Amino acid sequence: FPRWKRHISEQLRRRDRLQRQAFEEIILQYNKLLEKSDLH
């Protein structure tokens, strides 16, 4: 793989690490909580 393709792949994995993976569980958990709060 040429330098530029290596670059794109690295940057997309990094991107996912920062954006999707960081937030998935906490957003799911928060929504569980939100749904549990809606029961009053």
Partner: protein, 244 residues
């Protein structure tokens, strides 16, 4: 290569939806490759301890017909996460049929740009429906089963006839830029992102050139970018953003 396709396809943006000036904020991971009206049904649902909903980021209305990933890239990527979006109410959101029609018009423009003979128009309504459903139900396999053929070019040609791209500068409030641009130079070598910018938008070369939330090297061949970092509408949506 195939992993880049998937990584692009599965991109998510963490997003906080807050009601405009009691409603808790609502958090959601948005698909970068989709459209707001498609994926925000539950946001509309949720903001109804109230007695026609629209979205805005830092004063800018977020338009239904742009991909979510582009909107974020251009408007909010300079800011910290989650994307802070403000939810607004009208006293009186296009149809799914309206979105599907926009999407397909975009694919058709991209097709007419890429091929001497229109591949999309040689397909059956079946295949078009599978393209849309593929996008709508977040199914990479079903979508790319058809999208494959849209990414073919005859082997002897070294690339598409013209690359389908749109360049965005700073805000969606300024029209995007388009013009005919071939993937291969006269000499026969492959055109780069750098070459595209140099031609179509010389002032981007201080600035950030962002595609799907990352910054490719300018030396990246444009043909490959087209095949790999296009959105599902088969366009390269490119942001030019002020640093940082």
């Amino acid at each position: 290569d195939k992993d880049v396709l998937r990584d692009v396809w599965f991109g998510r943006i963490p997003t906080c939806f807050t009601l405009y000036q009691e409603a808790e904020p609502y958090y959601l991971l948005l698909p970068r490759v989709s459209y707001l009206t498609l994926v925000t049904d539950k946001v509309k649902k949720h903001f109804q301890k109230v007695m026609e909903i629209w979205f805005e980021y830092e004063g800018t209305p977020l338009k239904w017909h742009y991909p979510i990933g582009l909107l974020f890239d251009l408007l909010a990527s300079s800011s910290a996460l989650p994307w802070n979006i403000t939810v607004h109410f009208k006293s009186f959101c296009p149809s799914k049929d309206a979105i599907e029609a926009h999407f397909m018009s975009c694919m058709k423009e991209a097709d007419a740009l890429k091929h001497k003979s229109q591949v999309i128009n040689e397909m059956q309504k079946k295949d078009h429906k599978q393209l849309w459903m593929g996008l709508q139900n977040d199914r990479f396999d079903q979508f790319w089963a058809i999208n494959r053929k849209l990414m073919e070019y005859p082997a002897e040609e070294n690339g598409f006839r013209y690359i389908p791209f749109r360049i965005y500068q700073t805000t969606t409030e300024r029209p995007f830029i388009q013009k005919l641009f071939r993937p291969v130079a006269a000499d026969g070598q492959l055109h780069t992102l750098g070459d595209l910018l140099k031609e179509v938008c010389p002032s981007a070369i201080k600035n950030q050139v962002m595609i799907h939330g990352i910054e490719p090297m300018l030396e990246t061949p444009l043909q490959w970018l087209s095949e790999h970092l296009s959105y599902p509408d088969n366009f390269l949506h490119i942001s030019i953003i002020p640093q940082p």
